Structures are given as C-alpha cells and as structure tokens.
Amino acid sequence: FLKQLKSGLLLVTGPYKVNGVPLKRVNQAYTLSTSTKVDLTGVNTAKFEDDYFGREKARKNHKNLFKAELTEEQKKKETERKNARKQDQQAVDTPLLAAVKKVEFLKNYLASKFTLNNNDRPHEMKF
Amino acid sequence: SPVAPTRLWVKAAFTGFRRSKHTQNSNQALLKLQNVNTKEDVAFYQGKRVVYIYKGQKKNGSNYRTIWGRIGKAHGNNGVAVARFAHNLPPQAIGSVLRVMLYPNRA
Amino acid sequence: VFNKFVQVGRVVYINYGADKGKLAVIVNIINQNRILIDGEHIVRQVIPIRRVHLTKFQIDNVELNQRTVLLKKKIAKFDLTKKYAETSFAKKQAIKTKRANLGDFDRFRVMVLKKKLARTSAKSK
Amino acid sequence: MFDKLVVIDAKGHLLGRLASYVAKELLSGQRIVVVRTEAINISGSLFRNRVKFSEFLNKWMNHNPRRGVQHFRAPSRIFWRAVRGMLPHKTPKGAAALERLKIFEGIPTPYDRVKKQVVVDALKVQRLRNSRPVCKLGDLSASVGWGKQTLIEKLEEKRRARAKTYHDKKVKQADARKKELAAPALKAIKDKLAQFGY
Amino acid sequence: VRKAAQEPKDDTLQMKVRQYVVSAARLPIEQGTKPEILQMRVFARDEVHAKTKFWYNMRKLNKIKRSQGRILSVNEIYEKSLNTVKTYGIVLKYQSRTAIHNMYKEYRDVSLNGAVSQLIQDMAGNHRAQPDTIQIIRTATLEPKDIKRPATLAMRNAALKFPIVKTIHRPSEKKYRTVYKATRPTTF
RNA sequence: UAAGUCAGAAUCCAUGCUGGAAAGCAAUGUCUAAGUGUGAUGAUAAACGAAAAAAAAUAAAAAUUAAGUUCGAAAGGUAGAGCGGGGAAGAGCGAAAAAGCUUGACCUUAACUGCUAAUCGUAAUUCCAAAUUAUCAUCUACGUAAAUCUUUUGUAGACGACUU
RNA sequence: AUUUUUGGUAAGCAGAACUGGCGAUGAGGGAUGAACCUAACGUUGAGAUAAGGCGCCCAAAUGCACGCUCAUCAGAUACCAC
RNA sequence: GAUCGGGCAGCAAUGCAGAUCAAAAGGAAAACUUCAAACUGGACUGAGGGGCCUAAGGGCGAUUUUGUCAAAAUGGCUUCUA
Ligand SMILES: [Mg+2]
Ligand SMILES: [Mg+2]
Ligand SMILES: [Mg+2]
Ligand SMILES: [Mg+2]
Ligand SMILES: [Mg+2]
Ligand SMILES: [Mg+2]
Ligand SMILES: [Mg+2]
Ligand SMILES: [Mg+2]
Ligand SMILES: [Mg+2]
Ligand SMILES: [Mg+2]
Ligand SMILES: [Mg+2]
C-alpha cells in the first residue's frame, strides 16, 4: 500500500518485479490488511493522483448497437500511456525492492499467494 | 494444471430454506460455514457475499453460471446462517457447497 | 490405578466455564456433583465437579473452608505457578498461545522453515 | 462434515445415535462409509433385543410374504434399516441421502488403508452407565442366524496382523528420522522454529 | 429474568427462589394507633409471588383477606456468608394425590435459598410435588449436634476423596465441537 | 438372582428342502474385424489441500484432560538448474469388493538465476484435475465367434418356454 | 365443547340451562382427523411471537443444572383411545 | 475476645494450625435493581418528484460514484426437475 487517493481508492504496488502486480487502483473493501509492513522510504506518491489512471473508451452508440472497438489513434495513445507508466513505476518500485530486499523472506512472502488451509478459521485469525 | 492456485472463499453447505413443518420461506436459505460453530463466529460473516456456482451448457462462452447473495443473520445457536440470493436458490442445490467470500471489508 | 482423588485441597483445572484454562483449589465438597473453588485468578466459586479436571497436585497444607487470603498464600508457597508452568500440559498450552499470534508472514516463514527441515537432513557431516 | 469421505468405525458405538448422526451428515451431503457394523452396541439384555428382533421377524405382508418387508439378518443391514428409518427415504432427496451411505461388516479392502473415524457421542462407554445391560450387534445377528461371525473374526485377526507390520515399520523409521532431527544442522532449524512458536 | 443479587453468575446452577419478609396490617388504618402488624417469611420467585404466598398463608392462619388489609412492605433477606458450607434443615407440608404431608429435609449448600431450590427440585423428582402446593413451615441453619440425615452426615470428614471414575467428554467451547473425530477419547 | 454360573421344551434360529427377474456377486469357454484411432458438444445429490491407516483398553498405567493433531502448501508461465516426485518391461508379493505394494528402463520436477506479468483498467466461477460415460462426425479394418427363424426331438408344452 | 343438569346399568343414547363454537371457516399446534389449543384470512418483504416444540425424519440445544427410574410385558402426558 | 469442628499434636493433663461470630481504630471490593451517556459491525426498505415551511435548528419521508451489457442478452413461452 502506498497512499489513499481522493476518490478513495487505494494506491498499490506489488513490486512489479516480485509480485507482478504493477501499480494499482484498488478498493479498500476488496482487501485484507496484513500486520506485515514495509517502509517506503522512497515515497513518491505526490506524482500520482486519480486523474493519473484514465483510459479512453470506444464510442458505444445506438447506431452501432453499442458495438465498439478502439481506433489506431487510441491504440497509440494507450501504448504511450503504458510506456510512461512502465517508467514511473521503477521510480517507486526501486526504493521498494531495496526496502523489501532487506527483510529476510519478504521478497518470497510478497511473491507468494494467500490461500486458506482447510483447518482455518478466518473469523478468529490474527494477521 | 492440477488445481486452482488459491481459493479465497470459505466452504458453506446449503441446508435448506427457512421452514416450519408444513411451511417454508424460500427467500431465506440456510448455510453452514465450514468450521463455523456458534452464533458469535457466524456473526463475523454478517455482511459477507456468497456465491452459488453451477455448470451447464455454454452461455456467453462460459460453461458455468452463478447466483450471488449475502449471508444476513445468525440462524439458531450452531453456526447456521440465513443467506439471501438474487434468485432464490433452486432446491436441488440443497446437497451442495457454496462459496462464502470475504469481499465485504469496510471501515 | 486410583492415585488422583478429589480431596479437600486439590489442584484443579477449570474447563468449560467463564474461568476456563485457570487453575484453582478445592476447599469443600458440596454434595457429590459440586465443589468449592478458589485461587488467585478466580473468585470464590461453587462448581459442578463435571466442569473441572484434577491436576495431580495435592497441597496438604490446605485446611477445610480456608479463607481466600490464607489459601492464596499457601498456593503461592506451593508454586502452582512454576510447577504447572513446567507441565507438558502448560507447555503445549503456551505453544498454542504462540501459534495464535502469528501473521501472514509468520506462517509463510514457518512454511519455508518447515520445507527446509525436510529437504536438508542429508547433511551428514 | 466437509471431509470428502468420512469412514466410521462402528465398534463400541450405540446403534440409534450413530444412526442419527450419520443420518444428518447424509442429509447435508457428507458421504459416509460405516464399518465393523457387527461391532455396534445396543442398550438392553441381548435377550430383550432378541425378543425385539423376533417381534420384528413376526411382522409381514399377509397374503404375500415375498412382497414388502425383507427381514435382514446381517448387522450391516440392521444398521441400514436403522438409518433409513431416520431419513425421508421415499423422497428423491431422501434417496440421495441414502445412496451416500455404504455399510459393511469387518473392514473390507478399499478401507484397510483409509483412516477410520469415530463419533464421540455414540460410544457405549460415553453413553451408558457402566453397570447397565448391552449387546453387540453380531450377537443378535447370531441369535437370528447370520453365519459369518466366526469368519469375520478370523478375517479381522488377519488384518490386525498386517497392522502390526505397518505400525512397527512406521515406528522404527519414524524414530530414526526423529533421532537425525536432533543432529547439528537441523537442530539449528528446530531451534529457529521453536523460537518461532513451534 | 430478574436476578436477585445473591444468585450465582451462571443462572443454570440454581433456582429463582429468594427469601422474603412481608408485613401488612388490618385495613381500617387508624392513625395514632399501635397497629397489629402481621409479618411472615415466604419463599417466592417474585415480590408478587411472595405477596401471594403471604396472603394464602395469612387467610388460612387468620380472619384476614386482601380487601381487608394493606401491604406495608416486602423485604428480601440475604444469606450472611457464601464462603462456607452449611447444613440446612427445612420443615414442609406438601400435597400428594392421597393427602397432605409434613416432611423434614436437609441439604448441604451455601445458601438458604440454595437449600430451598434443591428442596424443590428434590420434592418434584422424588415426590412429584407441585411447587404451588409446598409450604415451608420452618427453616434452620443446622448446628452439627443437630444434623439428623445420613446423606448429610455422610459428608463430614476431611479424608473425603472421590476419584473421578468416568470423564464424559465435553469440549470447552462450542468452537471446538465436532460430531466425528479421528481418534477415541479416554476416561482418565 | 442382584452381578456371576448348570441343566432345560411339540418353542425360536439354524441344518436339510423348494423358489430365487436380489433391474445381487464369482469362476470359467469362445468372440468383440481396425488402431494405449482422433475431432466437437455433453451429463455425474456434488474437485480446488473437498488432505491423513496402528492395534486394544476405559475401573487401565511408570507416565501423557481433545484431530483443539500432524503432514502438505511459493508464479493455473518460459529458459536453465535439480532437493525431490511419478513410474515401461520383466521378475517379486498381494484376494473379504486383488485395492495394490517392491524393483525398474525412463518420465518429471523445489531452492537458486534471467526473461515474462502491467491496458483482463477500483469485484462479477479463479471454466483448466481425477473417475466415469452420451451424442454427432469422421480415418483405418469389408473380418471373427455364436445365436435365432424356416428343420428336429417328446424326458417338455395352452401359446412362448424347456430337454435334444 | 366447558360448567350445570334429567331418564337411563350404559352408549359416538334421549332430553334441558348460560356462554361459545361447528354448520357458514381457512392458518399453526394436538402425527392423523367438523366443534380442543393459538389464533380470524386483501397482494408482498422484514422482525419479534402465541399454541407447541428444538436426537433424526423436522425449523430450533444430542444446552446447562436437579431429584427419581432397569421392565425375560419399562416409559413417553390435556380434550385422546380406557 | 467468644463459640465450634469433618484438624496435627499429646498416652493423658495440654499446645500448634482452622473455621464461625466479633469490641474501639482503620482499610480495600464484588453481585443485583433502577435510571442515564456513548462506539462498531448486519439484514429489509426507499412510497413521493417541492419550493414551501420554521422552534432558526432544521423539516418536508435516498443521493453520489463507478463497472458491465449486442450475444438469445434480459423478460417470456413449451416441456421437464427439485
Ligand atoms: Mg445354557
Ligand atoms: Mg409361536
Ligand atoms: Mg370453575
Ligand atoms: Mg345429545
Ligand atoms: Mg360457561
Ligand atoms: Mg368459552
Ligand atoms: Mg345446512
Ligand atoms: Mg375456527
Ligand atoms: Mg414472514
Ligand atoms: Mg446429555
Ligand atoms: Mg431465459
């Protein structure tokens, strides 16, 4: 977790090298808060605010039967946005890898997925 | 591939609808969540969203189908809870396992 | 055989109560189903012998109907605390308490530590 | 109730109770297998339960005995009738419930290996005052002429002997792996975990 | 569900009897007078209940009826020390299908309320008595020289030991309850 | 007689006997042309560790009050690595419903290393395994064994059925 | 039907009194069933109940505490089946 | 200080230890009843389509944001199932 946007969404980085979850808008509701915390000493969040993730959507109109695809201009714009993001990430991920790399298993622990064990009891669990 | 990697849903059973000897409300299903035992523990799931998945002929390229609902309330003092779905669950469903999911996390 | 008895001044475990997981001593036997209970961490209670488990600690210093205070003293002098604390029972119990407090990372660790204990034993030398 | 197949060892279990439990489990989707039925217990004089089973032998469809009730004399079926009694067995749902239960006497092949389970509430020791009367099923099925008791015993012994083999091997090796767990390299990791809240 | 203060934390373990003192006077109510006050000890589960018990006994014992008198007050009595075991005697009259009977009973308990509750349960089970029918004549906390019953005197010794011969398995909370487990419990 | 024990009936249960389409099971003779043939669509009262083998005893013991256990558990990828996992043939053992266990050509994979993850846009089953089996379409094989009717017998028979 | 009643050995018989009810009336409970128990009905969702229940058929306690009981004919409750 | 007993002593005469009741002088606390103040998680619902109104605080009885939807999708029909 990085910071909480004004829209309310959570700002998020799986370190894209470790997780594969690159940089994400997420909802508070859809997540579980672990007591494991990594410091971001490299906090860059000022860069990123809501308007950062837009997207451009095709026109679904009553004359095309809401049958839509994106134009070439759109392919381009979106490609450019993507490269831009790829860049902006390393900025954030970079101090991250570092901070995370200094915590013993935290790299693997981040790489891993969270499953329930049969015997588990999510209602009494301590995270 | 051997299995699905991570399944984050708790297993629930569909007991039946909420009923009296001669009468049944089919609006309220009853579930028993795995390793959920007393009213206290059931309460923990109060708002939670629960799914009913089943398979069938191809509908929009997916061979499965779904009914979504929420556990609302503790039914009786062992672990049993009323669930409401969008479409009241079909009755053969009774023998079966439903997915309790942890999605509803709020402040 | 019959070595462990319910006696005036027995050391008992309170299970299935508001007081579960707590040691206590027995001052009197009220009928055949209920005993009179005390200790540092528990009010003076009447409890059905059913809810209780005999601990194999008999304090012969205890006296019939002993006041809460004097009891607490005798109990302290006996080290129910140290003695029980060494018990396989309390050891296991504490271990449980440990497992209780563990986070996602703690589990994960334990898992990698668990895998290692397995795959590494070939280290003869 | 969620384990894929429960297998219950009916030994020292009380008929009616083991019954109700397995029944519910069945209704709610648990697929069960009960074993060693010949070992189930019933509260009462063996006599009294023979009186009773006799009284049952006595019921029949008048004009045509070969229609309707079949009076089954094996412990397996005694239990089975018992459970069918506690389900709505004429209901398609009840049917399913039934199909889930399989029952045997002794412990047949597929079931050597799988772990046998117990219903705690159903135990003679747990349920009945020690000095009150009881029967084992196979004794009843004896009085009513189910011939296999002797065979089952022999067969059981055979399997007991395979057990001692499994176990002994399992012990020997499992001591050797516990001993080598106390060696230096791993003693380290042991300590790491203990501290970790073993 | 209204607890009297001297009842146990677990409502299960004892009946809802409490011991009351009720006192009233002939209705005419003359001011400066030095009234005859009629006072009685009743065991009931309510103030209301106590009033009933009161009046019943009072109309049997004396001329008075309720339209003829006034209730001055109802005061619950409490037991001194819940720290010791005491042997209580109780003297009863109850009504069995044939006739009416005077009984003397003893219970070892921590409260006179407990003595009574135990008395009622017993009287139901062994004698099929109806609570409403039961009349407690007199109640005494017993001095050792005075305790007559064998199941009472049975428990006086310090050398008292019960092995617990059979332990019926009873999980600690519900959270631990399983129908079927992978191994068999033990007794001891 | 309450526990505990003997004797003991034209009784009861068996033994013997007749049925036995119990939509039960076994052993055995021969055959099933052509392939451990493929394709598409499907169904299975219930896949996402739906994980897990001592035996016996509950008035036992020197000693352990709960499977309130233990084991497994990392990315539904690629390239390497290879703790480890699975197993041809044949040879061993194994029968209560023979379910499988050993050895074994070989097949495979975890730590670790590099790529690849992001635009599936703050959720909508995480559609993939295993055991079964239906339908349609097709490629190869145009064969093999046996039965029945049209005959026959009278050890049987209303007709079918049955012996031959 | 409750209570009160007369003839009658008696009757799920024959007659009377007050209040109901059933007929003309469904719903839940007494397994079952005109006159019992709760309760009186427009279509529908929620909640908490009455009568009655909560081992399984069956929603809900194999709850927590008491007393008493072993039947080679146990017992299991209003109107109810003696 | 006084009683008592289901103590250890003691051969007895007696002491140690208790438990109950308790003087003046001090301490420190539990359960119940009543009446109040306040936090957090759920379920069901949103009838109506104004500018009027006032105790000057508000009332008059849900708004906001976002995602998906072209394909038989949604609703229905016939048949069947629970
Ligand atoms: Mg004999
Ligand atoms: Mg006869
Ligand atoms: Mg009257
Ligand atoms: Mg008449
Ligand atoms: Mg009247
Ligand atoms: Mg009336
Ligand atoms: Mg008419
Ligand atoms: Mg009516
Ligand atoms: Mg309703
Ligand atoms: Mg019980
Ligand atoms: Mg449709």
Q: Where are the alpha helices (DSSP H) in E25-77?
A: 47-61
Report how far residue D75's alpha carbon sits from residue D53's, in angstroms, rounded to the nearest whole number: 12
Q: Which amino acid is at C70?
A: L
Rg from Cα positions in chain A: 19
DSSP 8-state secondary structure symbol assigned to residue E12: G
CB C110 within 8 A of CB C103: no
Rounded Cα gap, residues D66 and D56, in angstroms: 16
Contact across the interface for C121 and D196, Cβ inside 8 Å:
no
Determine contact, residues B67/B11, Cβ cutoff 8 Å. Answer: no
Phi, psi (deg, nearest 5) at residue A51: -55, -10
Cross-chain Cβ contact C68/E173 below 8 Å: no
Classify E87 as helix, strand or coil. Answer: strand
Q: Which two tokens stand for residue E89?
A: 């005697």
Segment D177-186 long-range contacts (CB within 8 Å, at least 24 positions apart): D177/C121, D180/C121, D181/C117, D181/C121, D183/C121, D183/C123, D183/C124, D185/C120, D185/C121, D185/C123, D186/C117, D186/C120, D186/C121, D186/C123
Which chain B residues contact residue E176 at CB under 8 A?
Answer: 37
Closest protein CA to C1' of nucleotide F123, residue: A30
Residue contacts between A and C (CB atoms, under 8 Å): 28
Instruction: Tell me the sheet residues that pair with E76.
Output: E20
Q: In sequence order, what DSSP letters do the residues of E104-141 get, joined into one string?
A: EEEEEES-HHHHHHHHHHHHHHTT---GGG-EEEEEEE
**Ligand 4 centroid – CA D7 distance (Å):** 65
Strands D32-35 and D6-9: parallel
CA–CA distance from A36 to each of A17, C102, C113, D185, E173 (Å)?
A: 19, 10, 18, 29, 31
* E64, containing H or E segment: none
Q: Compute the distance between CA of residue A81 and CA of residue A53 in angstroms, rounded to an integer.
A: 9
- Between CA E14 and CA E18, with CA E17 as vertex, the angle to 5 degrees is 115
B64 DSSP β-pair partners: B55
For chain D, the helix, strand and coil percentages under 3-state DSSP, each to the nearest 5: 55, 10, 35
d(CA E89, CA E140): 5
* Ligand 9 centre distance from Cα of residue B25 (Å): 8
User: Does at least one atom of strand G sit less than 7 Å from the CB of E154?
Assistant: no
How far from A118 is each of A115, A121, B8, D86, E183, CA to CA, in Å? 10, 9, 11, 30, 19
CA D75 to C1' F93, in angstroms, rounded, equals 34
Q: How many Å lie between the alpha carbon of D116 and the closest alpha carbon of chain E?
A: 7
> By C-alpha distance, which of C111, E70, E130 is closest to D196?
C111
- Experimental method reported for this structure: X-ray
Nearest-5° Cα angle at B69, B67 to B74 = 140
- Given a contact cutoff of 8 angstroms between Cβ atoms, the answer to whether E109 and E79 are in contact is no
Q: By the 8 A CB rule, do B14 and B54 touch? A: no
